[PDB]
Structure formats: structure tokens, C-alpha cells
Design a protein around this nucleic acid. Sequence first.
DNA 1: CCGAAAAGGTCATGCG
DNA 2: CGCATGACCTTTTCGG
Length: 89
Amino acid sequence: GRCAVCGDNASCQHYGVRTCEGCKGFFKRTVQKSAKYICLANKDCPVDKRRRNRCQFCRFQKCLAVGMVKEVVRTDSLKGRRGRLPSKP
DNA sequence: CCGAAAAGGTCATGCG
DNA sequence: CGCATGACCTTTTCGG
Ligand SMILES: [Zn+2]
Ligand SMILES: [Zn+2]
């Protein structure tokens, strides 16, 4: 695979990291809802394409480990805003 | 021009 | 049934 989080297939960048649509949305919803997870085990559950949903905390933990930027998740004035932002005058 | 990039929108799906 | 997941879509811009 190519997803730096679960290992699934990935075609491009998401919140700074090569991720799959799965991890893509997970990171998003989490950051929007500001969800707070808790690990039942010992914060080191297996995060791969097959067991990525067994534990949330751990999946988000890795999302950050590989550097997904929480700041890139549009909010406020940018909430609901799609596509690429403008960079040129 | 045009399509690669990538952020949010959409439900069908399914397990709980 | 109720909510979470994720395959696929539409939206914006800009780089080749
Ligand atoms: Zn993944
Ligand atoms: Zn865990």
C-alpha cells in the first residue's frame, strides 16, 4: 500500500500526508467534531487496512504521528468551502 | 486550455 | 434504528 497510516491504497495528499480516503475522512470528522478518543488497550493497537476501525484513538494517534495537519481541516469562515484556496493575486 | 491536486459533499452499507 | 465508515462525486485553483 501507500497510505502512511493504515497502508491502504493512496493516490494523493490529505492534510499533509499521503493517505487513503478511509483515513482521509477519519481525520476530518475527528478534527471537525473535535472528537476525543480513548484506547481500551494500551495505546498501541494495530493500525492497518484491516484493523484500523477496531480502535479509534490509535488510528488518530498515528494520523498525527505521520504528521496530518489538523489546521488544514477548514473551519469557521472556511467551513463548507471546497477545492483549492487561492494563492495568486 | 486542462488536467493534477486536494478540500468538502454524498449517501449506500453494515456492524453494532 | 442510529451513527460511522469510505468509494465516488463536485468544487476551486493553479502549474505544465
Ligand atoms: Zn489509511
Ligand atoms: Zn488503541
